[model samples]
Structure formats: structure tokens, C-alpha cells
Target: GSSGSSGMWSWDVECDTCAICRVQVMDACLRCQAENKQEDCVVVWGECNHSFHNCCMSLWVKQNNRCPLCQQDWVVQRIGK
Candidate 1:
């Protein structure tokens, strides 16, 4: 997802040809789906390149506000010890 305001991050998947599609609501990450689990919330990659349960990415971002694979910044926050 590029940004919420760009319409790129908006949840819509009518076009099947578009690879860079926004995440569908109530969707879980690959890991969570693999584990046969689901999440109530999730923050997928801004690039919309990866999928993650909201809880997973939320916690991940809180600890480290960036994508693990692409290292893309999702949430802007101050870091401190």
C-alpha cells in the first residue's frame, strides 16, 4: 500500500491483473495462515508486497517500525531505550 490517501492502499481488488493490490480486510499473514490461525487486526506492508496479521505487524512495528523483509517504514515513531 503506497498510502491511505493515495487510493493505492485502499481495500479494493476488482482488477485481477493488478499485482500491487491492497490487502483484503480480515486477512491474515502467510505465517498465521500457515499456522491455521487468524488475527483481528493487521498492518500489511506499505508497498503491499507482504501480508501479515494486524496483531503480528502491530506488535512488530511497536518493537521495530519496519518491515522485516523489505525494511519499509509503516508507522512513524520515536525510538528510545
Candidate 2:
């Protein structure tokens, strides 16, 4: 893993895809469904290190600010373009 500021470190993960949306990395959130977006979608990471589509995450956080999978605090650790 590569260490950075704020005790942050990054490692090469196996899949960059979003398990919740079942879409490839950078793909639009699942809400679009069959109708995909032209522009690349944003990737939001939770404090638990779980990642999700920006739109999907936003909707989820609205209901509960916790990771859908890990049940951890849904703190916005990173927002990747």
C-alpha cells in the first residue's frame, strides 16, 4: 500500500466496480438503469473503504449515513472524478 497524508494509504484492489450498482467503475449510478449517462459518473468512498456510485450513495446516505454493506459510518472519505 502507498501511504499518504492523514494516515491515508491506497492499495491496488481487485475490482474497481461497484457491487451495489453492479456497474463498471466510472459508470453512472444504478438509477439510470438501462439509460446510461454520457459523462463519467463520480465514485464515492465510505469511511469503511466501501465504494459506491455517487448518486446511489447520496440516496443511501439520505436514509442512513452508514455503509450499506459494512454498516459503518458513511463518512465521505474520497470523491473521485
Candidate 3:
């Protein structure tokens, strides 16, 4: 649920096949329900260590304008120093 933690995983549109496989974002979450069974939406990690679904969360970030895991504003102020 929190970001930057060890369990944290982020999604990558380039390295993921969840979307193409019709996997939904909600399913990717470990806490999601059985109805939301999206196996393809694998987890990915950002430079900040935030985790999300490669395709689903990517769309979520672009659409909701926030982090799907922490609900924080997705802003890349800077990369690792």
C-alpha cells in the first residue's frame, strides 16, 4: 500500500504484457478481489521505489494524475543523484 518499501513493485508499459492480455489494474494488487483477476498486470518499480502495474497503473497515472499505490501526486522532480 505504501511506496518505496521493499514489497513495493512498479509497472512498465514496455516490459509488461498485462494490458495486451486484458489484465486489469485492480487484479494486480495483492489485496484485490477474485473478480479482479488480472495476472498479466505485473508489478514494476520506479526510480523512487514506488510500485504499480505496468500497463494498468501507467494508464491510471496518466488518467487519475496520481500514484495508484500511495495516491501521491506522480511528479518526477529528479532522478537518482
Best by TM-score: 2
TM-score of each: 0.38, 0.60, 0.34
lDDT by residue (31-51, candidate 3, tens digit) is 333446445545554544564
* lDDT per residue as tens, model 2, 1-81: 998768677886747567666766466766665566625467887778777888777776777777767778678898886
Q: Candidate 3, residue 44: CA error in Å?
A: 1.3
* Count of backbone collisions in candidate 1: 5
| Cα error, candidate 3, residue 56 (Å) | 2.7
User: Candidate 1 versus the native: TM-score?
Assistant: 0.38
Tell me the deviation in Å of residue 11 in model 1. 32
Worst 10 residues of 2 by lDDT: 31-40
